[PDB]
Amino acid sequence: LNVQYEPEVTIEGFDGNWYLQRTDVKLTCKADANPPATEYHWTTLNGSLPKGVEAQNRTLFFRGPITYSLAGTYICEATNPIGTRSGQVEVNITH
């Protein structure tokens, strides 16, 4: 297209406060750009992946209900010919 921009990374899924007993607590990472992407980077603020999440492509599928060990910042970066952008989300567990 006439416009070329670095991929816009967005987090989708449960919008709001995350409830312990809910399977709706999964998140999807989307990068929107003129070209899809050349590379995709998925990393959390802790640099590691929790044992409660099942990762599939740019989709964060939670294996079940959200737990305290599932709380934190999930970030993803997309590498494109126009640049690299990252999106993050901060999940908190209800009390």
Side-chain angles (χ1 to χ4, degrees):
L1 262 85
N2 73 302
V3 201
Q4 49 141 66
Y5 54 100
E6 319 91 283
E8 308 263 75
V9 210
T10 335
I11 318 298
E12 264 199 347
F14 210 43
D15 200 332
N17 221 301
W18 273 282
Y19 287 68
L20 281 133
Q21 23 189 104
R22 239 209 201 243
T23 19
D24 223 4
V25 294
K26 71 111 227 282
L27 312 162
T28 319
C29 192
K30 12 223 299 213
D32 174 89
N34 225 238
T38 69
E39 251 209 347
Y40 255 113
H41 283 213
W42 319 290
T43 355
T44 68
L45 219 103
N46 218 256
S48 348
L49 338 126
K51 56 186 118 172
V53 295
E54 242 220 35
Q56 208 76 212
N57 200 243
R58 29 157 245 185
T59 328
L60 217 345
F61 236 104
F62 283 46
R63 233 331 227 107
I66 224 173
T67 1
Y68 263 62
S69 9
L70 247 29
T73 332
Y74 296 172
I75 324 140
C76 16
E77 324 200 272
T79 319
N80 279 55
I82 322 106
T84 313
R85 289 242 249 264
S86 341
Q88 73 278 96
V89 70
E90 272 255 75
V91 21
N92 70 284
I93 315 311
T94 14
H95 93 114

XYZ file of all heavy atoms in Angstrom:
747
model
N 0.848 -1.215 0.000
C 0.000 0.000 0.000
C 0.871 1.248 0.000
O 2.090 1.157 0.120
C -0.916 0.010 1.227
C -2.342 -0.495 0.989
C -2.402 -2.012 1.098
C -3.303 0.152 1.978
N 0.240 2.408 -0.127
C 0.959 3.678 -0.133
C 1.539 3.982 1.246
O 2.470 4.778 1.376
C 0.040 4.822 -0.589
C -0.992 5.211 0.457
O -1.797 4.388 0.891
N -0.984 6.470 0.865
N 0.997 3.335 2.271
C 1.478 3.518 3.632
C 2.157 2.258 4.134
O 1.596 1.164 4.053
C 0.342 3.871 4.611
C 0.894 4.537 5.862
C -0.696 4.755 3.947
N 3.361 2.416 4.648
C 4.075 1.320 5.274
C 4.432 1.702 6.701
O 5.019 2.758 6.946
C 5.334 0.955 4.484
C 6.205 2.147 4.123
C 7.684 1.834 4.238
O 8.213 1.008 3.492
N 8.360 2.480 5.175
N 4.057 0.858 7.641
C 4.275 1.147 9.045
C 4.685 -0.107 9.788
O 4.382 -1.222 9.355
C 3.013 1.748 9.674
C 1.765 0.907 9.490
C 1.299 0.091 10.513
C 1.049 0.938 8.299
C 0.155 -0.669 10.357
C -0.093 0.179 8.133
C -0.536 -0.622 9.165
O -1.679 -1.376 9.005
N 5.382 0.089 10.893
C 5.808 -1.003 11.742
C 4.579 -1.670 12.346
O 3.566 -1.008 12.573
C 6.730 -0.482 12.852
C 7.733 0.564 12.380
C 7.216 1.984 12.511
O 6.396 2.408 11.667
O 7.615 2.685 13.462
N 4.644 -2.980 12.604
C 3.478 -3.743 13.044
C 2.895 -3.220 14.350
O 3.612 -2.983 15.320
C 4.021 -5.164 13.225
C 5.498 -5.007 13.342
C 5.850 -3.812 12.508
N 1.587 -3.051 14.362
C 0.879 -2.594 15.545
C 0.495 -3.792 16.401
O -0.367 -4.584 16.020
C -0.371 -1.804 15.146
C -0.096 -0.688 14.153
C 0.056 0.661 14.821
O 1.112 0.909 15.440
O -0.884 1.483 14.730
N 1.140 -3.931 17.547
C 0.926 -5.088 18.399
C -0.159 -4.808 19.426
O -0.115 -3.810 20.148
C 2.211 -5.516 19.126
C 2.205 -7.013 19.373
C 3.441 -5.111 18.332
N -1.122 -5.702 19.480
C -2.288 -5.548 20.328
C -2.551 -6.823 21.122
O -2.258 -7.923 20.649
C -3.532 -5.222 19.484
O -3.137 -4.598 18.254
C -4.479 -4.309 20.244
N -3.113 -6.674 22.315
C -3.449 -7.819 23.152
C -4.961 -7.960 23.275
O -5.660 -7.014 23.638
C -2.841 -7.714 24.572
C -1.395 -7.204 24.519
C -2.909 -9.066 25.275
C -0.453 -8.111 23.762
N -5.450 -9.144 22.953
C -6.869 -9.441 23.004
C -7.122 -10.563 23.995
O -6.203 -11.286 24.353
C -7.367 -9.857 21.625
C -7.987 -8.723 20.836
C -8.858 -9.218 19.704
O -8.796 -10.424 19.377
O -9.602 -8.405 19.123
N -8.348 -10.691 24.455
C -8.680 -11.770 25.358
C -9.660 -11.322 26.408
O -10.697 -10.743 26.082
N -9.341 -11.572 27.666
C -10.196 -11.114 28.747
C -9.932 -9.642 29.032
O -8.846 -9.267 29.471
C -9.986 -11.950 30.007
C -11.213 -12.059 30.868
C -12.457 -12.290 30.300
C -11.124 -11.925 32.243
C -13.588 -12.389 31.090
C -12.251 -12.024 33.038
C -13.485 -12.254 32.460
N -10.929 -8.811 28.770
C -10.795 -7.375 28.972
C -11.317 -6.978 30.342
O -12.527 -6.896 30.558
C -11.546 -6.603 27.880
C -11.067 -5.167 27.730
O -10.578 -4.584 28.721
O -11.182 -4.609 26.618
N -10.399 -6.758 31.270
C -10.775 -6.320 32.595
C -10.009 -7.046 33.676
O -8.849 -7.405 33.486
N -10.662 -7.262 34.808
C -10.053 -7.967 35.928
C -10.146 -9.469 35.698
O -11.193 -9.972 35.293
C -10.754 -7.591 37.236
C -9.783 -7.405 38.386
O -9.048 -8.321 38.746
N -9.772 -6.218 38.974
N -9.059 -10.182 35.948
C -9.018 -11.602 35.689
C -9.470 -12.384 36.912
O -8.994 -12.157 38.025
C -7.611 -12.013 35.271
C -7.379 -11.860 33.802
C -7.805 -12.702 32.821
C -6.679 -10.797 33.143
N -7.415 -12.236 31.592
C -6.722 -11.069 31.763
C -6.020 -9.645 33.582
C -6.132 -10.232 30.823
C -5.435 -8.816 32.642
C -5.495 -9.115 31.275
N -10.396 -13.299 36.696
C -10.973 -14.077 37.778
C -10.298 -15.433 37.870
O -10.043 -16.071 36.849
C -12.479 -14.245 37.566
C -13.269 -12.985 37.832
C -13.146 -11.877 37.005
C -14.130 -12.899 38.919
C -13.862 -10.722 37.246
C -14.851 -11.748 39.167
C -14.710 -10.661 38.329
O -15.430 -9.514 38.573
N -10.005 -15.857 39.097
C -9.318 -17.123 39.340
C -10.012 -18.277 38.622
O -9.408 -18.966 37.809
C -9.256 -17.419 40.841
C -8.174 -16.656 41.611
C -8.751 -16.042 42.877
C -7.002 -17.573 41.942
N -11.292 -18.463 38.902
C -12.041 -19.562 38.305
C -12.739 -19.122 37.022
O -13.947 -18.875 37.005
C -13.056 -20.136 39.297
C -13.463 -19.170 40.400
C -14.283 -19.841 41.480
O -13.785 -20.124 42.569
N -15.546 -20.098 41.186
N -11.960 -19.009 35.957
C -12.489 -18.708 34.633
C -11.487 -19.141 33.572
O -10.285 -18.931 33.724
C -12.803 -17.213 34.492
C -14.260 -16.927 34.152
C -14.412 -15.641 33.352
N -15.771 -15.101 33.433
C -16.595 -14.964 32.388
N -16.185 -15.268 31.159
N -17.828 -14.505 32.572
N -11.986 -19.752 32.509
C -11.137 -20.247 31.435
C -11.017 -19.207 30.325
O -10.295 -19.388 29.347
C -11.721 -21.549 30.867
O -13.108 -21.643 31.223
C -10.980 -22.757 31.412
N -11.730 -18.108 30.512
C -11.759 -17.000 29.560
C -10.527 -16.112 29.695
O -10.471 -15.021 29.133
C -13.021 -16.164 29.754
C -13.666 -15.783 28.438
O -13.181 -16.233 27.377
O -14.673 -15.053 28.463
N -9.537 -16.589 30.430
C -8.417 -15.757 30.853
C -7.241 -15.860 29.885
O -6.103 -15.582 30.246
C -7.942 -16.179 32.259
C -9.017 -15.894 33.296
C -7.556 -17.655 32.273
N -7.538 -16.209 28.642
C -6.516 -16.364 27.620
C -6.345 -15.057 26.858
O -7.239 -14.208 26.863
C -6.881 -17.506 26.663
C -8.048 -17.193 25.737
C -7.591 -17.048 24.293
C -8.173 -15.800 23.648
N -9.594 -15.991 23.257
N -5.207 -14.900 26.197
C -4.897 -13.658 25.501
C -4.355 -13.930 24.109
O -3.651 -14.899 23.880
C -3.893 -12.829 26.314
C -4.244 -12.677 27.791
C -3.024 -12.251 28.600
C -5.384 -11.687 27.957
N -4.705 -13.074 23.184
C -4.257 -13.195 21.815
C -3.395 -12.000 21.447
O -3.742 -10.863 21.764
C -5.453 -13.271 20.851
O -6.478 -14.112 21.399
C -5.023 -13.800 19.490
N -2.277 -12.241 20.795
C -1.419 -11.152 20.381
C -1.522 -10.963 18.879
O -1.321 -11.902 18.108
C 0.030 -11.448 20.775
S 1.145 -10.013 20.635
N -1.851 -9.750 18.467
C -1.999 -9.439 17.057
C -1.073 -8.307 16.656
O -1.017 -7.281 17.326
C -3.450 -9.068 16.725
C -4.332 -8.832 17.943
C -5.703 -9.468 17.770
C -6.447 -8.875 16.581
N -7.915 -8.825 16.806
N -0.337 -8.500 15.577
C 0.451 -7.425 15.007
C -0.107 -7.052 13.645
O -0.136 -7.878 12.734
C 1.912 -7.826 14.893
N -0.564 -5.818 13.514
C -1.138 -5.355 12.263
C -0.161 -4.460 11.527
O 0.287 -3.447 12.056
C -2.446 -4.599 12.513
C -2.998 -3.964 11.249
O -3.772 -4.633 10.529
O -2.666 -2.791 10.965
N 0.174 -4.846 10.314
C 1.037 -4.054 9.469
C 0.684 -4.322 8.020
O -0.089 -5.239 7.736
C 2.498 -4.372 9.750
N 1.218 -3.517 7.110
C 0.957 -3.714 5.685
C 1.397 -5.116 5.251
O 0.593 -5.871 4.709
C 1.621 -2.624 4.833
C 0.684 -2.080 3.776
O 0.977 -2.127 2.582
N -0.456 -1.557 4.207
N 2.667 -5.500 5.479
C 3.065 -6.895 5.399
C 2.834 -7.580 6.743
O 2.950 -6.932 7.783
C 4.551 -6.813 5.071
C 5.014 -5.539 5.698
C 3.813 -4.629 5.799
N 2.480 -8.876 6.747
C 2.203 -9.618 7.983
C 3.311 -9.455 9.024
O 3.162 -8.700 9.986
C 2.098 -11.083 7.524
C 2.568 -11.100 6.104
C 2.320 -9.724 5.560
N 4.422 -10.152 8.812
C 5.573 -10.076 9.703
C 6.719 -10.895 9.139
O 6.498 -11.833 8.366
C 5.220 -10.583 11.095
N 7.938 -10.540 9.501
C 9.089 -11.344 9.144
C 9.489 -12.196 10.338
O 9.900 -13.347 10.186
C 10.289 -10.488 8.671
O 10.835 -9.731 9.755
C 9.867 -9.544 7.561
N 9.336 -11.634 11.534
C 9.590 -12.386 12.753
C 8.592 -12.060 13.849
O 7.966 -11.008 13.848
C 11.026 -12.180 13.240
C 11.903 -13.407 13.052
C 13.004 -13.513 14.085
O 13.253 -12.526 14.806
O 13.626 -14.592 14.180
N 8.431 -13.001 14.767
C 7.535 -12.840 15.897
C 8.262 -13.225 17.180
O 8.837 -14.310 17.276
C 6.295 -13.725 15.720
C 5.035 -12.977 15.335
C 4.453 -13.162 14.087
C 4.420 -12.100 16.220
C 3.296 -12.496 13.730
C 3.263 -11.426 15.872
C 2.703 -11.629 14.626
O 1.541 -10.968 14.279
N 8.247 -12.338 18.154
C 8.928 -12.573 19.418
C 7.927 -12.574 20.558
O 7.141 -11.648 20.699
C 9.997 -11.506 19.665
C 11.251 -11.701 18.865
N 12.498 -11.350 19.325
C 11.442 -12.206 17.624
C 13.400 -11.625 18.403
N 12.783 -12.147 17.359
N 7.942 -13.621 21.359
C 7.056 -13.699 22.509
C 7.875 -13.867 23.781
O 8.629 -14.829 23.920
C 6.069 -14.863 22.349
C 5.535 -15.006 20.954
C 4.676 -14.159 20.312
C 5.829 -16.058 20.026
N 4.422 -14.618 19.042
C 5.116 -15.785 18.844
C 6.627 -17.206 20.082
C 5.179 -16.618 17.728
C 6.688 -18.031 18.972
C 5.969 -17.733 17.811
N 7.749 -12.914 24.695
C 8.466 -12.977 25.965
C 7.714 -12.237 27.062
O 7.068 -11.226 26.812
C 9.882 -12.377 25.854
O 10.164 -12.014 24.495
C 10.925 -13.365 26.348
N 7.802 -12.740 28.279
C 7.176 -12.087 29.411
C 8.182 -11.186 30.108
O 9.373 -11.223 29.793
C 6.629 -13.115 30.416
O 7.715 -13.812 31.045
C 5.723 -14.114 29.715
N 7.711 -10.388 31.056
C 8.588 -9.495 31.802
C 9.546 -10.290 32.689
O 10.554 -9.767 33.156
C 7.766 -8.537 32.660
C 8.309 -7.109 32.729
C 7.494 -6.178 31.846
C 8.312 -6.612 34.164
N 9.215 -11.554 32.918
C 10.045 -12.431 33.737
C 11.002 -13.232 32.863
O 11.893 -13.919 33.361
C 9.166 -13.378 34.556
C 9.701 -13.612 35.956
O 10.264 -14.666 36.251
N 9.521 -12.634 36.832
N 10.800 -13.146 31.550
C 11.674 -13.822 30.608
C 11.376 -15.305 30.471
O 12.007 -15.996 29.673
N 10.411 -15.795 31.232
C 10.071 -17.212 31.215
C 8.571 -17.406 31.009
O 7.795 -16.456 31.120
C 10.516 -17.867 32.522
O 11.371 -17.003 33.253
N 8.169 -18.631 30.710
C 6.762 -18.942 30.496
C 6.230 -19.783 31.648
O 6.868 -20.757 32.058
C 6.565 -19.690 29.171
C 7.673 -19.495 28.133
C 8.210 -20.840 27.664
C 7.159 -18.686 26.951
N 5.065 -19.405 32.201
C 4.424 -20.151 33.286
C 3.884 -21.502 32.813
O 3.584 -21.686 31.636
C 3.271 -19.238 33.732
C 3.533 -17.916 33.086
C 4.288 -18.217 31.827
N 3.740 -22.432 33.749
C 3.323 -23.795 33.427
C 1.809 -23.903 33.235
O 1.290 -24.977 32.947
C 3.770 -24.753 34.534
C 3.270 -24.364 35.916
C 3.853 -25.261 36.996
C 4.689 -24.467 37.987
N 5.120 -25.291 39.148
N 1.103 -22.792 33.401
C -0.344 -22.817 33.298
C -0.846 -22.386 31.933
O -2.027 -22.544 31.616
N 0.037 -21.815 31.132
C -0.335 -21.340 29.812
C 0.140 -22.293 28.715
O 1.251 -22.818 28.774
C 0.217 -19.923 29.547
C -0.422 -18.917 30.492
C 1.736 -19.888 29.674
N -0.712 -22.525 27.727
C -0.327 -23.285 26.548
C -0.170 -22.340 25.360
O -1.152 -21.806 24.841
C -1.366 -24.365 26.239
C -0.814 -25.782 26.319
C -1.339 -26.689 25.223
O -1.546 -26.206 24.087
O -1.543 -27.892 25.492
N 1.065 -22.132 24.936
C 1.363 -21.161 23.892
C 1.195 -21.774 22.508
O 1.701 -22.862 22.234
C 2.774 -20.619 24.067
N 0.476 -21.070 21.646
C 0.237 -21.531 20.289
C 0.336 -20.364 19.314
O -0.578 -19.540 19.231
C -1.141 -22.184 20.202
C -1.251 -23.247 19.123
C -0.574 -24.552 19.506
O -0.057 -25.269 18.650
N -0.575 -24.872 20.793
N 1.449 -20.301 18.584
C 1.700 -19.211 17.644
C 1.728 -17.876 18.397
O 2.459 -17.735 19.375
C 0.635 -19.212 16.535
C 1.060 -18.454 15.291
O 0.446 -17.455 14.930
N 2.104 -18.920 14.627
N 0.925 -16.908 17.967
C 0.846 -15.624 18.657
C -0.359 -15.607 19.591
O -0.848 -14.549 19.986
C 0.758 -14.462 17.654
C 0.092 -14.832 16.339
C -0.480 -13.616 15.632
N -1.937 -13.667 15.546
C -2.677 -12.772 14.894
N -2.096 -11.766 14.250
N -3.996 -12.883 14.881
N -0.835 -16.791 19.941
C -1.976 -16.920 20.829
C -1.552 -17.463 22.185
O -0.883 -18.497 22.276
C -3.048 -17.851 20.234
O -3.053 -17.740 18.802
C -4.429 -17.521 20.791
N -1.937 -16.759 23.233
C -1.706 -17.223 24.581
C -2.967 -17.905 25.079
O -3.927 -17.246 25.482
C -1.350 -16.039 25.494
C -0.304 -16.303 26.585
C -0.080 -17.794 26.796
C 1.007 -15.609 26.240
N -2.967 -19.220 25.059
C -4.123 -19.966 25.501
C -3.886 -20.475 26.902
O -2.982 -21.267 27.143
C -4.416 -21.129 24.550
C -5.811 -21.106 23.990
C -6.044 -20.690 22.689
C -6.887 -21.506 24.763
C -7.326 -20.671 22.172
C -8.171 -21.488 24.252
C -8.390 -21.071 22.954
N -4.685 -20.009 27.832
C -4.552 -20.456 29.201
C -5.143 -21.847 29.326
O -6.182 -22.141 28.737
C -5.216 -19.475 30.161
C -4.396 -18.235 30.394
C -3.819 -17.554 29.331
C -4.206 -17.746 31.674
C -3.072 -16.415 29.540
C -3.460 -16.604 31.890
C -2.893 -15.939 30.822
N -4.474 -22.708 30.075
C -4.834 -24.121 30.093
C -6.099 -24.365 30.907
O -6.720 -25.423 30.807
C -3.687 -24.972 30.641
C -3.289 -26.128 29.731
C -4.462 -26.635 28.902
N -4.573 -28.091 28.928
C -5.512 -28.760 29.600
N -6.404 -28.108 30.337
N -5.562 -30.083 29.527
N -6.466 -23.385 31.710
C -7.658 -23.483 32.510
C -7.942 -22.186 33.227
O -7.946 -21.123 32.607
N -8.166 -22.245 34.539
C -8.432 -21.065 35.355
C -7.151 -20.299 35.676
O -6.075 -20.893 35.797
C -9.060 -21.649 36.635
C -9.181 -23.122 36.406
C -8.185 -23.464 35.344
N -7.264 -18.984 35.816
C -6.099 -18.152 36.066
C -5.638 -18.282 37.519
O -6.442 -18.276 38.452
C -6.349 -16.667 35.668
C -5.126 -16.130 34.922
C -6.678 -15.776 36.867
C -5.323 -14.755 34.332
N -4.337 -18.444 37.695
C -3.757 -18.641 39.010
C -2.751 -17.536 39.312
O -2.403 -16.761 38.422
C -3.067 -20.013 39.088
O -3.178 -20.679 37.823
C -3.694 -20.878 40.170
N -2.273 -17.470 40.552
C -1.366 -16.402 40.968
C -0.061 -16.443 40.174
O 0.547 -15.406 39.910
C -1.077 -16.495 42.469
C -1.943 -15.576 43.310
C -3.325 -15.723 43.342
C -1.377 -14.561 44.071
C -4.117 -14.883 44.106
C -2.162 -13.718 44.837
C -3.531 -13.883 44.853
O -4.317 -13.043 45.616
N 0.348 -17.640 39.773
C 1.570 -17.817 38.998
C 1.375 -17.401 37.540
O 2.327 -17.386 36.760
C 2.015 -19.277 39.072
O 1.016 -20.081 39.683
N 0.141 -17.067 37.177
C -0.172 -16.664 35.813
C -0.196 -15.144 35.706
O -0.328 -14.587 34.612
C -1.527 -17.245 35.393
C -1.492 -18.307 34.286
C -0.177 -19.075 34.293
C -2.659 -19.266 34.438
N -0.062 -14.484 36.849
C -0.070 -13.029 36.905
C 1.268 -12.463 36.443
O 2.319 -13.061 36.680
C -0.380 -12.559 38.318
N 1.229 -11.310 35.794
C 2.449 -10.687 35.321
C 2.249 -9.940 34.020
O 1.117 -9.684 33.614
N 3.348 -9.588 33.365
C 3.287 -8.858 32.110
C 3.640 -9.754 30.928
O 4.768 -10.248 30.829
C 4.243 -7.653 32.122
O 4.419 -7.180 33.464
C 3.713 -6.526 31.246
N 2.674 -9.975 30.047
C 2.921 -10.715 28.820
C 3.161 -9.738 27.676
O 2.339 -8.866 27.420
C 1.738 -11.632 28.494
C 1.491 -12.729 29.517
C 0.357 -13.527 29.437
C 2.381 -12.964 30.560
C 0.123 -14.528 30.359
C 2.152 -13.963 31.485
C 1.020 -14.740 31.381
O 0.787 -15.732 32.304
N 4.294 -9.887 27.011
C 4.711 -8.974 25.949
C 5.001 -9.771 24.676
O 5.463 -10.911 24.742
C 6.004 -8.222 26.355
C 6.012 -7.914 27.854
C 6.173 -6.939 25.557
C 7.367 -8.105 28.499
N 4.716 -9.197 23.528
C 5.126 -9.800 22.273
C 5.664 -8.732 21.335
O 5.168 -7.611 21.312
C 3.964 -10.546 21.614
S 2.321 -10.131 22.287
N 6.675 -9.091 20.567
C 7.282 -8.189 19.599
C 7.148 -8.773 18.207
O 7.212 -9.985 18.033
C 8.761 -7.953 19.906
C 9.098 -7.908 21.385
C 10.418 -7.219 21.645
O 11.462 -7.899 21.613
O 10.422 -5.986 21.853
N 6.943 -7.929 17.221
C 6.841 -8.397 15.853
C 7.916 -7.742 15.015
O 8.081 -6.521 15.066
C 5.462 -8.104 15.286
N 8.655 -8.533 14.252
C 9.708 -7.978 13.437
C 9.253 -7.903 11.996
O 8.834 -8.901 11.414
C 10.984 -8.819 13.540
O 11.184 -9.217 14.903
C 12.195 -8.045 13.048
N 9.287 -6.704 11.449
C 8.864 -6.461 10.082
C 9.928 -5.623 9.379
O 10.803 -5.069 10.040
C 7.514 -5.726 10.068
C 6.331 -6.657 10.267
O 6.275 -7.405 11.236
N 5.374 -6.610 9.354
N 9.871 -5.492 8.041
C 10.854 -4.697 7.294
C 10.773 -3.206 7.625
O 11.678 -2.437 7.307
C 10.479 -4.941 5.829
C 9.046 -5.346 5.864
C 8.865 -6.100 7.150
N 9.685 -2.801 8.270
C 9.492 -1.405 8.626
C 9.979 -1.145 10.049
O 10.275 -0.010 10.418
C 8.008 -0.995 8.498
C 7.370 -1.676 7.287
C 7.869 0.516 8.380
C 6.435 -2.807 7.648
N 10.090 -2.209 10.837
C 10.573 -2.073 12.195
C 10.042 -3.152 13.119
O 9.415 -4.112 12.672
N 10.288 -2.974 14.408
C 9.876 -3.925 15.429
C 9.112 -3.209 16.524
O 9.597 -2.235 17.101
C 11.092 -4.637 16.055
O 11.983 -5.088 15.028
C 10.656 -5.819 16.910
N 7.918 -3.686 16.797
C 7.109 -3.127 17.855
C 6.730 -4.227 18.823
O 6.787 -5.408 18.477
C 5.859 -2.463 17.288
C 6.144 -1.174 16.535
C 5.464 0.013 17.199
N 4.377 0.554 16.382
C 4.517 1.584 15.549
N 5.692 2.188 15.426
N 3.478 2.014 14.845
N 6.345 -3.844 20.021
C 6.029 -4.804 21.062
C 4.748 -4.405 21.786
O 4.460 -3.220 21.950
C 7.183 -4.886 22.062
O 8.383 -4.380 21.499
N 3.986 -5.393 22.215
C 2.807 -5.125 22.995
C 2.810 -5.949 24.253
O 3.235 -7.097 24.237
N 2.332 -5.368 25.329
C 2.357 -5.999 26.626
C 1.015 -5.836 27.326
O 0.271 -4.886 27.074
C 3.482 -5.410 27.492
C 3.209 -4.001 28.005
C 3.533 -2.933 26.979
O 2.656 -2.464 26.257
N 4.791 -2.533 26.912
N 0.716 -6.780 28.189
C -0.480 -6.744 29.000
C -0.128 -7.180 30.416
O 0.739 -8.035 30.604
C -1.594 -7.647 28.416
C -1.244 -9.120 28.565
C -2.934 -7.340 29.067
N -0.778 -6.596 31.406
C -0.483 -6.931 32.785
C -1.698 -7.583 33.406
O -2.757 -6.968 33.536
C -0.112 -5.678 33.581
C 1.364 -5.332 33.526
C 2.094 -5.671 34.811
O 2.353 -6.866 35.061
O 2.430 -4.740 35.574
N -1.536 -8.837 33.780
C -2.626 -9.613 34.331
C -2.514 -9.674 35.847
O -1.434 -9.912 36.397
C -2.691 -11.047 33.719
C -1.357 -11.454 33.112
C -3.143 -12.082 34.743
N -3.629 -9.428 36.507
C -3.698 -9.502 37.949
C -4.739 -10.524 38.338
O -5.750 -10.683 37.653
C -4.049 -8.144 38.564
C -5.478 -7.724 38.280
O -5.806 -7.297 37.170
N -6.337 -7.835 39.281
N -4.481 -11.233 39.409
C -5.421 -12.212 39.891
C -6.309 -11.609 40.966
O -5.841 -10.876 41.842
C -4.705 -13.463 40.426
C -3.594 -13.904 39.465
C -5.701 -14.588 40.620
C -4.027 -13.994 38.014
N -7.594 -11.894 40.861
C -8.592 -11.385 41.788
C -8.305 -11.823 43.224
O -7.644 -12.839 43.458
C -9.992 -11.874 41.384
O -9.876 -12.933 40.422
C -10.814 -10.738 40.795
N -8.815 -11.060 44.179
C -8.616 -11.356 45.589
C -9.947 -11.261 46.320
O -10.886 -10.676 45.743
C -7.579 -10.398 46.212
C -8.163 -9.173 46.862
N -8.102 -8.932 48.218
C -8.834 -8.125 46.327
C -8.711 -7.791 48.488
N -9.164 -7.285 47.358
